[PDB]
Amino acid sequence: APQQINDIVHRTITPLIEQQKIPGMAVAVIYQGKPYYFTWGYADIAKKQPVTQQTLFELGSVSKTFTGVLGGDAIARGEIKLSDPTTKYWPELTAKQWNGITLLHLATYTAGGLPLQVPDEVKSSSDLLRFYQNWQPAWAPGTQRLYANSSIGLFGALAVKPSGLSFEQAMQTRVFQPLKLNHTWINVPPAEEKNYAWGYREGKAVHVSPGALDAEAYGVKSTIEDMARWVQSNLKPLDINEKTLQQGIQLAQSRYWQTGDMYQGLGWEMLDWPVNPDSIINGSDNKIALAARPVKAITPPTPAVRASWVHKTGATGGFGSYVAFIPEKELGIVMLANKNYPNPARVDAAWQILNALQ
Numbered sequence: 001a002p003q004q005i006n007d008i009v010h011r012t013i014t015p016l017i018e019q020q021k022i023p024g025m026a027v028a029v030i031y032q033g034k035p036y037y038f039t040w041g042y043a044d045i046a047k048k049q050p051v052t053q054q055t056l057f058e059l060g061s062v063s064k065t066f067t068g069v070l071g072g073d074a075i076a077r078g079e080i081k082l083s084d085p086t087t088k089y090w091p092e093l094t095a096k097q098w099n100g101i102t103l104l105h106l107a108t109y110t111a112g113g114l115p116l117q118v119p120d121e122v123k124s125s126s127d128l129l130r131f132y133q134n135w136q137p138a139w140a141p142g143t144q145r146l147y148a149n150s151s152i153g154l155f156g157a158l159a160v161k162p163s164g165l166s167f168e169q170a171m172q173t174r175v176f177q178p179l180k181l182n183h184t185w186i187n188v189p190p191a192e193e194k195n196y197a198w199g200y201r202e203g204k205a206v207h208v209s210p211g212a213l214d215a216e217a218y219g220v221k222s223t224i225e226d227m228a229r230w231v232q233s234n235l236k237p238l239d240i241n242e243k244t245l246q247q248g249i250q251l252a253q254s255r256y257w258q259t260g261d262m263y264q265g266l267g268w269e270m271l272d273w274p275v276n277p278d279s280i281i282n283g284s285d286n287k288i289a290l291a292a293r294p295v296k297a298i299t300p301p302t303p304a305v306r307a308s309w310v311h312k313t314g315a316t317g318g319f320g321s322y323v324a325f326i327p328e329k330e331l332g333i334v335m336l337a338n339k340n341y342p343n344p345a346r347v348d349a350a351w352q353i354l355n356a357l358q
């Protein structure tokens with residue numbers, strides 16, 4: 001491994017782990033297209049299992065990038081259009097407030113204030129219908145961004161309806177398999193349980209609990225190797241042999257809305273490179289905690305801009321993840337941890353590392 005890569009990673013991550021009390025961590029740096037791997041600590045404290053390049057971490061909301069891309073793939077296949085009314089794919093959604101709410105709004109959290117979480121009370125399909133029918137927007141569609149699992153979650157579920165595949169089957173066949181992400185899972189199979197890290201929340205070992213639209217919004221588990229390959233696939237989508245998938249990746253990094261210095265993609269969020277630290281450390285997306293922001297429509301959406309900081313933060317109760325890349329520089333980072341530690345700390349470390357390497 002290049003000593004420059006070795007030194008910046010270790011010097012940045014070691015104190016991060018110490019200060020955040022992170023039980024276990026995996027990091028990939030993509031430098032000139034090539035992945036370099038680094039691991040620390042424990043996937044399972046009790047059983048003394050170390051973090052390896054084969055350890056599975058819960059990605060949490062980094063799952064939304066897969067959802068966005070699968071969605072873009074369905075657009076490329078001609079199965080859906082982002083301008084489609086939500087009701088085209090869910091005709092039972094007859095409540096009036098849904099008039100004017102498109103798949104674009106769902107995908108980009110601009111539907112008019114769909115809540116961050118689907119309520120735990122929603123435990124059936126009829127429950128979910130009731131929930132969406134009864135939801136009252138605070139804002140007109142396409143006027144404000146409010147980060148919401150119930151928004152992109154619903155986008156994910158509807159985007160696959162024409163295919164007739166379940167969200168999981170469609171994700172596996174159309175994204176995971178073609179990209180050879182053979183250790184990326186919506187549901188961790190028994191064969192992989194030995195590699196599945198425990199997350200840690202207030203000293204307890206925890207895994208994400210099932211919930212409505214969890215797959216679509218926060219339910220992917222992946223290894224550092226697969227995540228590096230995910231970054232490579234998004235850094236240079238033209239190297240991909242399946243056309244619709246290559247096009248789907250491109251669509252996911254298009255710029256649909258602007259708030260402040262950030263542009264909303266499908267799952268991915270983007271800022272112009274070079275970035276103000278600062279404006280990302282600071283920043284988004286979210287406002288964590290939690291931020292209704294006015295959006296300016298980008299009419300029409302700007303195609304994927306090479307000179308971008310493209311990123312997504314993700315958490316579950318026991319895990320914290322971060323992915324960032326700069327297409328123009330063939331440069332990226334994945335940080336996977338089995339503790340949910342503050343977003344600004346992840347962004348700072350990712351910035352420290354990538355700035356030094358570009």
Ligand SMILES: C[C@H](C(=O)O)N1C(=O)[C@@H]2[C@@H]3CC[C@@H](C3)[C@@H]2C1=O
Nearest residue numbers: 054180181182183191192195225
């Ligand atoms: C398919 C490939 C192989 O050896 O052909 N492979 C496996 O062996 C399973 C086991 C050995 C490594 C991992 C678990 C997974 C993998 O990539």
Ligand SMILES: C[C@H](C(=O)O)N1C(=O)[C@@H]2[C@H]3CC[C@H](C3)[C@@H]2C1=O
Nearest residue numbers: 060061149218313314315316317
């Ligand atoms: C990943 C995301 C984030 O940090 O950006 N996030 C969470 O903390 C988890 C908790 C579990 C689902 C929801 C709440 C989920 C969420 O939106």
